[PDB]
From Swiss-Prot, chains A, B:
Lineage, opening ranks: Eukaryota, Metazoa, Chordata, Craniata, Vertebrata
Known glycosylation sites: N51, N58
The protein's name: Immunoglobulin heavy constant mu
Residues represented out of the complete protein: 222 to 433 of 474
UniProt organism field: Homo sapiens (Human)
Residue stretches making up the Ig-like domain: 8-98, 108-209
Annotated gene: IGHM
Top-level lineage group: Eukaryota
Disease: Agammaglobulinemia 1, autosomal recessive: A primary immunodeficiency characterized by profoundly low or absent serum antibodies and low or absent circulating B cells due to an early block of B-cell development. Affected individuals develop severe infections in the first years of life.
Effect of D209A: Blocks IgM BCR assembly
Variant or mutagenesis effect after changing T186A: Has little effect on IgM BCR assembly
Length: 212, 212
């Protein structure tokens, strides 16, 4: 009997320029006649959700609810909760969601790594690594750009923010992109751009080519 | 009401040259008078476990049991199960554990990446990446060697085997080690050695220095 909510990730916030709240139901049998409403700390309600979900095929029911809010209150840390009503439960369950500020806010550093000389001898593939170290909190966004045009999210893999051993609280993350030699040796540059909330303009780009 | 077992990882098997089986209890209240025994597919028993565990402080009970076996039967895929007896359960629960063979067995490739030129300008740290791509199944072991002497496992971080987008079934993993510039520019070589069960001798070493 759980209902887990999804706080907005800085990745989505920077990608869409619009803060949403999301919560889903779990550990409950599929049913109907369920209403989802978001209530803030004071008590008043917000815009109505849309896009009613379905039931998972694993004897679990899930409902999704959307609410558009300003980013200032979320950054401040207002207490937010969505309301879920069901049949078996006697009292509707409340799910507290909030983001604090005491988390340190250090700007990260960006490093790009060209492929090894010895990998470009099989003439089959190449790998470029964009390396980000030393940021707090644990929300980062990385994407790859080719000739000013975004690449599909199916050609690169991004690691989750995992802590440095040599620090009390700090993190790092990795991303590698798979291209073809003829492209790397004779193609274009795949800039990696990272967006962190501790950055001045929240945007940082680095460029890597064959002759760097 | 679950009891999850730990199949031997190729990492542990290669590290200790001795195959063990392990199973732990969960989702049960702490109690006593519990016996753990391993039974193979035929029905006969094996050596007695040791090192009785304790109870987790989260209202969960756990028992650990050890059994030493040959590697040939485990590689073949014999059906193995440890027996757990408790008070509330009417019938002892059996936990089936076995490793198959239909998993592909491609040898991996090893790549070492020196630190970026631009990171060695802050004169504060350096990072070396050992990159392993294209192996099956999902069991790998990586460790770092300095002047023939193993380094402590608290100075490097190893990724989990996660699949390549450009392949039906294949994986890769990463590892980065943190050293000091004066060490990297004027120190020794930190060889990364990887052990995979598809390799001929199960051992592969690569060497990287300042002048490579």
């Amino acid at each position: 009997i759980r209902v887990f909510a999804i706080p907005p990730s800085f990745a989505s916030i920077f990608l869409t320029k619009s803060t949403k709240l999301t919560c889903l139901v779990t550990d409950l049998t599929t049913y109907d006649s369920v209403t989802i409403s978001w209530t803030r700390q004071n008590g008043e309600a917000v815009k109505t959700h849309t896009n009613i979900s379905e039931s998972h095929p694993n004897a679990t029911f899930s409902a999704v609810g959307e609410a558009s809010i300003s980013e200032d209150d979320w950054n401040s840390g207002e207490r937010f909760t969505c309301t879920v009503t069901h049949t078996d439960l006697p009292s509707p369950l409340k799910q507290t969601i909030s983001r604090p500020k005491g988390v340190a806010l250090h700007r990260p550093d960006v490093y790009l790594l060209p492929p090894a000389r010895e990998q470009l001898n099989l003439r089959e593939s190449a790998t470029i690594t964009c390396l980000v170290t030393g940021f707090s909190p644990a929300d980062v966004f990385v994407q790859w750009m080719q000739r000013g045009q975004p690449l599909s999210p199916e050609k690169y893999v991004t690691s989750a923010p995992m802590p440095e051993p040599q620090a009390p609280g700090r993190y790092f993350a990795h991303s590698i992109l798979t291209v073809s030699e003829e492209e790397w040796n004779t193609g274009e540059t795949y800039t990696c751009v990272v967006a962190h909330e501790a950055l001045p303009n929240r945007v940082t780009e680095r460029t890597v080519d064959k002759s760097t």
